[PDB]
Ligand binder design. Sequence first.
Ligand code: HEM
Length: 104
Amino acid sequence: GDAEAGKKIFVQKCAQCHTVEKGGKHKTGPNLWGLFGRKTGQAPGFSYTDANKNKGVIWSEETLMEYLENPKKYIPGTKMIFAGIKKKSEREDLIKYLKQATSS
Ligand code: HEM
């Protein structure tokens, strides 16, 4: 994974609805700090759909790779309205960036 490439992908496709830094604001979507190793739908203070709260998996590289390829397929009923990122390489780079930005 290439975090530098990932950072650019984040700005292009995710930043309009998400922040990732510690203490960052919730916007259309939840601030994502602390995401890795945590069960779905647990960002503090964000109002999730029951679907996002109930998916039940632990976010990590593997689960984010599947989710980001097609969000509504992975979480039917989600209010995250976004097509997904088809390219495996792009998802890997994006996730690399997310791991770095949301864990420090
Ligand atoms: C960009 C490609 C992108 C990423 C990365 C991303 C991630 C993401 C995660 C990991 C969650 C779940 C967090 C958790 O379970 O705690 C999540 C949730 C929502 N998102 Fe998102 N998201 C990306 C892009 C976008 C875009 C462009 C929007 C807005 C149009 C958006 C919105 C949302 C919303 C809303 C949620 C909450 C969904 C719910 O059902 O509660 N995301 N995202």
